[PDB]
Amino acid sequence: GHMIKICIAGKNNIAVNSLQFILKNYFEADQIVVIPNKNDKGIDSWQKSLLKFALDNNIKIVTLDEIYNIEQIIFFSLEFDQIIKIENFKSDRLFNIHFSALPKYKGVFTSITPILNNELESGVTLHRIDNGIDTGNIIDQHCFPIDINDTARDLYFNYLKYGESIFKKNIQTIINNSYKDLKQTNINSSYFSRKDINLVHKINFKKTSFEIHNQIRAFIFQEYQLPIINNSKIIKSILANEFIGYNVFEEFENYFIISGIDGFKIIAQKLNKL
Amino acid sequence: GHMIKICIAGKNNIAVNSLQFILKNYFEADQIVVIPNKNDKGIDSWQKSLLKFALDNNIKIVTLDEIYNIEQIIFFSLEFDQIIKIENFKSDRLFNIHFSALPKYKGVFTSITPILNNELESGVTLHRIDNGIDTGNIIDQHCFPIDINDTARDLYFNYLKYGESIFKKNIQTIINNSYKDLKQTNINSSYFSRKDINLVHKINFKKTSFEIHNQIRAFIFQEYQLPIINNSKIIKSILANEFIGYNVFEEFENYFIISGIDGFKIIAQKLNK
Ligand SMILES: Nc1nc(=O)c2c([nH]1)NC[C@@H](CNc1ccc(C(=O)N[C@@H](CCC(=O)O)C(=O)O)cc1)N2C=O
Ligand SMILES: Nc1nc(=O)c2c([nH]1)NC[C@@H](CNc1ccc(C(=O)N[C@@H](CCC(=O)O)C(=O)O)cc1)N2C=O
Ligand SMILES: Cc1cn([C@H]2C[C@H](O)[C@@H](COP(=O)(O)OP(=O)(O)O)O2)c(=O)[nH]c1=O
Ligand SMILES: Cc1cn([C@H]2C[C@H](O)[C@@H](COP(=O)(O)OP(=O)(O)O)O2)c(=O)[nH]c1=O
Ligand SMILES: [Cl-]
Ligand SMILES: [Cl-]
Ligand SMILES: [Cl-]
Ligand SMILES: [Cl-]
Ligand SMILES: [Cl-]
Ligand SMILES: [Cl-]
Ligand SMILES: [Cl-]
């Protein structure tokens, strides 16, 4: 019977827009609490700030320890950074939106790992939180394409959009506790940790054009880093069906022309191109 | 035309059985020549020797240099070990059966690479040889499952069986030169070289059970090697859907019980040897 009905924990446009949605449609400000990620400085930047939205709309900021004992609270992680232990919570209403098509690509850097592993599609998945990393039972999933020249950043913005949508699609059944779920399968399950990914990726050119292009574009996310080829930052990679011969590599003022062991043209655009 | 009509280059039961098939159904011995792989000494083992079958059936052994100038020769690579350059040959009738579902898994160790990269299926592909590594246009393909507990060796034996079948399915149209082919796509194309694969694999246990299982069984091919956990060789991995808790690892006299970050039970059976 507590005042507080729901907690939004996490960051970025998905957390802010989902919070705004529930404030507009389901709960009053005094029924909601927020746990921003540790790094949230309260500044709207290339993403909206959850801390800023809470402060601007009179939504209380809390810690996990403040909400553990709240009976029946709905806890939603939307890019939240702390692993929870479910036995801390009195409530069993604990949910996450994970930026992959589970069971594939559990873990981190999920705007990098599907592209680096040659996928043509990804997804967002709403699931129950259990004590493992993105291992809980799936409630809903939406799969969508990774277009051939999408960068990690382009994929991330698609996760924000489709994740916000799957939140809205499912929130009423979460609130009325009538949702259905299904155990994740063992097969196809994959996982990457921060140690598995070197963000300063050294490209293996003894690979197909599709693999070289994926090795480039998986690391294009300018707020964090850009790939460097021959001491030049790369902002875009374009893969064509044109055969140009095997193992081409040529540097120009504004781009590189590259092909791998199957000979298909890649244009890797330098950041300095006007 | 020249006496010689066809060259079978390569090894193992796919080469021997495809050569037997064409000797029975199409060609006389004098019309066929063979190029065995470098290490074939004419002794059958866990696969038949191509060199031995040729000698036993009065088929001549040749080098590539001896066939370049033979007009209209059919050249067929069946696990052959040398990259050819097509402009050496007068003939454009140059074909390979590659042990993967192209365009995926160009290159080598293709009983290892699909498993290691978490595939549920593989295939055999008949294609024209061009100057790149498994890059030429596809003539036919047969895909098939990698069962959940199959090892690299099990996969290899399936390539030999399905590869022999796709050879028999297509040989008449190759002989008649009526076959059809299609360029490979750029998307999905992948490639592994010998440098990419360390055959003494160190397992990463901070992975899912399906990934740990695949890391083990991708290297089980006893005639070459077996993967080693705590100085025991593993002969079989078994992945179940039973949840046993996250990140289990326990060693027993005859097996290990392992789970990864998602908690599904693996039994890694030690070689009884
Ligand atoms: N129990 C739980 N399950 C989840 O699926 C989940 C939560 N909590 N809390 C919110 C969010 C947190 N997700 C994560 C994912 C990875 C790390 C992390 O620190 N990974 C380390 C390895 C940690 C380890 O090995 O124990 C790394 O280096 O990658 C932290 C939080 N989340 C779902 O999104
Ligand atoms: N031109 C050509 N294309 C082919 O697709 C083909 C042939 N020849 N000849 C028969 C067979 C030979 N396949 C191969 C495949 C890889 C290596 C090899 O030596 N790979 C080295 C890398 C070589 C390099 O980078 O140039 C390695 O270390 O992996 C040799 C023969 N074959 C299709 O089967
Ligand atoms: C932290 C970081 C993220 N990214 C990108 C790729 C990630 O999928 C995306 C979101 O990362 P983020 O959610 O901040 O990290 P995590 O995956 O550890 O929870 O930002 C980088 O490219 N480089 C980085 O250094
Ligand atoms: C040479 C080698 C092969 N193999 C297995 C996996 C290979 O897919 C299969 C056949 O290899 P093989 O055709 O001899 O070598 P390549 O791929 O270089 O042409 O045998 C091993 O497991 N270990 C080895 O050392
Ligand atoms: Cl906290
Ligand atoms: Cl669950
Ligand atoms: Cl699933
Ligand atoms: Cl040659
Ligand atoms: Cl030469
Ligand atoms: Cl071709
Ligand atoms: Cl194709």
mmCIF file of C-alpha atoms and ligand atoms in Angstrom, chain A residues 35-36 62-66 68 80-82, ligand 5:
data_model
loop_
_atom_site.group_PDB
_atom_site.id
_atom_site.type_symbol
_atom_site.label_atom_id
_atom_site.label_comp_id
_atom_site.label_asym_id
_atom_site.label_seq_id
_atom_site.Cartn_x
_atom_site.Cartn_y
_atom_site.Cartn_z
ATOM 1 C CA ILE A 35 17.697 5.784 -9.794
ATOM 2 C CA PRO A 36 19.946 7.503 -12.356
ATOM 3 C CA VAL A 62 16.476 7.261 -4.538
ATOM 4 C CA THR A 63 18.973 4.409 -4.044
ATOM 5 C CA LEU A 64 18.363 0.664 -4.396
ATOM 6 C CA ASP A 65 18.525 0.308 -0.616
ATOM 7 C CA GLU A 66 15.516 2.670 -0.287
ATOM 8 C CA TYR A 68 14.142 -2.992 -1.571
ATOM 9 C CA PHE A 80 20.792 0.755 -15.656
ATOM 10 C CA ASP A 81 24.372 0.025 -14.705
ATOM 11 C CA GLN A 82 24.140 -1.962 -11.434
HETATM 12 CL CL CL C 5 21.836 2.523 -5.535
#
